[PDB]
């Protein structure tokens, strides 16, 4: 859950979403890509 | 202090030894000696004479 100030995709399954205003990135290849704020 | 007069050595820095009497007249300070053949100190191998000293264990036949 990286609270980094910039999210960018690292896998190819990564998607950038819009949940509750806060921009987020998930990935289901290595669920270590999950982050916020970017 | 002691003296291990002889041409072998094994002992270690932290072994237990034995002490007998014997002076030197080369070393001011020594007045004892080692006892080889006895406890955890090995005697000199293949010194056939004076075998009651130095513990050579009678080279076979």
């Amino acid at each position: 859950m990286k609270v980094r100030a910039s999210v960018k995709k690292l896998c190819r399954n990564c998607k950038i979403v819009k949940r509750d205003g806060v921009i987020r990135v998930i990935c289901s290849a290595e669920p270590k890509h999950k982050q916020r704020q970017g | 202090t002691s003296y291990i007069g002889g041409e072998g050595h094994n002992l270690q820095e932290h072994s237990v030894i034995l002490i007998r009497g014997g002076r030197v007249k080369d070393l001011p300070g020594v007045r004892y000696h080692t006892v080889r053949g006895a406890l955890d100190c090995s005697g000199v191998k293949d010194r056939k004479q004076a075998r009651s000293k130095y513990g050579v264990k009678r080279p076979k036949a």
């Binding site: - | 270690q12 932290h14 072994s15 237990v16």
Partner: protein, 666 residues
């Protein structure tokens, strides 16, 4: 002779072993050589003396198991119903098949939740490669287990248990479970006819077998190692304990029913002669344990195999060549040291006060030639040094490790001639500290342990040529004038026998020749005392071109002093570097460890040097520096289900990095 029973209850940690043993001891009435009694239907209910060899708990320290295996004639292999067979269960199986000693399998934890008998049986066949035989079967589930059905005698026993599980009742198999449990009734008649074809005729003839004949079938296969027997059990809630010994008295051999040893000799035409199972043969025994009692003395255990001893005879123990004598022989009932003067062939005894009895001495009472046995061959895996809090308390534990290197053959010691402290050695983490604890509580030496130092050699690299050393210390009447211009090499590693070479290279008549060997001996004093780290130096071949001398200043002590003043600069000008002692390690990690172990090895700065695959073993060899090698096998057993090990040998050296040069500090 037919009545005695030398049994060993060997088991994995937490299997039930200690709790099983207590149910043996509590039943049979109504240390390492506990005795017992029982009366068996297989031998017409005459009394039978069980001599329970206490098997070592930590089977990790494999040597103590190996001694234990030989002295036991039978063995109960305790297992866990929920967990199946275990890593150390396969480990103790290795020691057992090595000495050919047959077993019986004991499924404990039947009361525990998740207990299936069939689990273990499958686990028996799959991993260990055995052909198991189900003797009895649980009536009901984990909580509902009350019944034991001996399918060989085709009877049943239950337990409401009513007084600690001792009194029992006769039943038959209830209707809900006859048909599915009779599959293994069908398993019994087919696995009992290949040893004698007379039982093959009854199967293809239609004759259902009676009780005593099938024992004649099954016992011989647990005499010649073909099939094993698997009995159910539960010690902690005591259901299946009466027939547990009635598994041992019906199947396992006795001191007459074991093959006599095919041991080697040491005289004459070096032919194998026997130590027969006759009670009136010329005696020989084998001492296995040494314990100092609280207040009985120095117990000198041994097993009584064959012959008669009237106690108080001399012994011709021809592995040390010394004649000792006896105090008594002791056998314990619970640990009850009730005395005895009669040494019956097939019993086990614990003699007292014999001075120089080691572990593994083959002793002879009527002074006959021995049946020589040499069996101390596991090797400890750790080289860890000590630090006792007083040097007078150090040689007392150096006497206690000098006792512990005299009681247990692989917990040896390493006398360090070179580094002021000694090394305790073991095969495992826990066996090291339990002897640290035993010398903490019993022998009373507390230890703030420290890790050892490393051998730490050096080498140089630059091709320096000129470097000289002058010493014109005249100053008085008789002084010292030396001048020996030296030269050296980044020498070849392993072609020459010794790591340094020397050669006369005088141009004219500029030095007296007699000093020229003495210069080499002075460098021979000044090689191994390096000014870098106080650690000895190797790998340079020094040549010597130019020189000078004098008439009145010709002490040869000068021609060894300034040769070091030439080597004070000469060390300083070829940019040297320490050499790390590199090991040569090999490790067999069977199949599901390879990704872990090679990842473990590469983190320990080793290089990939290939592998093979013998039938199950993927054995990887490598070369590894000795810097951070404190505890490799503990790091290896953690990631390998504690199965694999390692045995190494120091071979070579290599270029050390600067962090090992950061370990210079002084």
């Amino acid at each position: 002779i037919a009545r005695y029973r030398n049994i060993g209850i060997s088991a994995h940690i937490d299997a039930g072993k200690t709790t099983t043993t207590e149910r043996i001891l509590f039943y049979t009435g109504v240390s390492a050589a506990t005795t017992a009694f029982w009366s068996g239907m297989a031998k017409q209910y005459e009394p039978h003396r069980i001599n329970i060899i206490d098997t070592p708990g930590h089977v990790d320290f494999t040597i103590e198991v190996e001694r234990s295996m030989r002295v036991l004639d039978g063995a109960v292999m305790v297992y866990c119903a929920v967990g199946g067979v275990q890593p150390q269960s396969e480990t103790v199986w290795r020691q057992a098949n090595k000495y050919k000693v047959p077993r019986i399998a004991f499924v404990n934890k039947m009361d525990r939740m998740g207990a299936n008998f069939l689990k273990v049986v499958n686990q028996i066949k799959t991993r260990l490669g055995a052909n198991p035989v189900p003797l009895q079967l649980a009536i009901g589930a984990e909580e509902h287990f009350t019944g034991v059905v001996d399918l060989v005698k085709m009877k049943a026993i239950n337990w409401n248990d009513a007084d600690q599980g001792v009194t029992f009742e006769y039943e038959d198999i209830p209707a809900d479970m006859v048909e599915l449990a009779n599959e293994w009734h069908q398993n019994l008649i087919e696995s009992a006819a290949e040893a004698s074809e007379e039982l093959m005729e009854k199967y293809l003839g239609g004759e259902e077998l009676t009780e005593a004949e099938i024992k004649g079938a099954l016992r011989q296969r647990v005499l010649n190692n073909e099939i094993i027997l698997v009995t159910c059990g539960s010690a902690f809630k005591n259901k299946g304990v009466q027939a547990m010994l009635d598994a041992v008295i019906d199947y396992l051999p006795s001191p007459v029913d074991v093959p006599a040893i095919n041991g080697i000799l040491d005289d004459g035409k070096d032919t194998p002669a026997e130590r027969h199972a006759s009670d009136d043969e010329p005696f020989s025994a084998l001492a296995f344990k040494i314990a100092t009692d609280p207040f009985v003395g120095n117990l000198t255990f041994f097993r009584v195999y064959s012959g008669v001893v009237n106690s108080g005879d001399t012994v011709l123990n021809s592995v040390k060549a010394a004649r000792e004598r006896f105090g008594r022989i002791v056998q314990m009932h619970a640990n009850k040291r009730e005395e005895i003067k009669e040494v019956r062939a097939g019993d086990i005894a614990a003699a007292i006060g014999l001075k120089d009895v080691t572990t593994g001495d083959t002793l002879c009472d009527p002074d006959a030639p021995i049946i020589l046995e040499r069996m101390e061959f596991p090797e400890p895996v750790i080289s860890i040094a000590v630090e006792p809090k007083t040097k007078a308390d150090q040689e007392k534990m150096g006497l206690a490790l000098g006792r512990l290197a005299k009681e247990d053959p692989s917990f040896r010691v390493w006398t360090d001639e070179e580094s002021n402290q000694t090394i305790i050695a073991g095969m495992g983490e826990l066996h090291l500290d339990i002897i640290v604890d035993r010398m903490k509580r019993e022998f009373n030496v507390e230890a703030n342990v420290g890790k050892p130092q490393v051998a730490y050699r050096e080498t140089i690299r630059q091709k320096v040529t000129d470097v000289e050393g002058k010493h014109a210390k005249q100053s008085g009447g008789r002084g010292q004038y030396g001048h020996v211009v030296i030269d050296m090499y980044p020498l070849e590693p392993g072609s020459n026998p010794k790591g340094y070479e020397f050669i006369n290279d005088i141009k004219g008549g500029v030095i007296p020749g007699e000093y020229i060997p003495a210069v080499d001996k002075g460098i021979q004093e000044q090689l191994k005392a390096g000014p870098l780290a106080g650690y000895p130096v190797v790998d340079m071949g020094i040549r010597l071109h130019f020189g000078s001398y004098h008439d009145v200043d010709s002490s040869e002590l000068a021609f060894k002093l300034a040769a070091s003043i030439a080597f004070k600069e000469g060390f300083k000008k070829a940019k040297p570097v320490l050499l790390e002692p590199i090991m040569k390690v090999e490790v067999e990690t069977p199949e599901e460890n390879t990704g872990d172990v090679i990842g473990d090895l590469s983190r320990r700065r080793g290089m990939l040097k290939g592998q093979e695959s013998e039938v199950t073993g993927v054995k990887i060899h490598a070369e590894v520096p000795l810097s951070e090698m404190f505890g490799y096998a503990t790091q290896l057993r953690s990631l390998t289900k504690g199965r694999a090990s390692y045995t190494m040998e120091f071979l070579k050296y290599d270029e050390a990095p600067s962090n090992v040069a950061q370990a210079v500090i002084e």
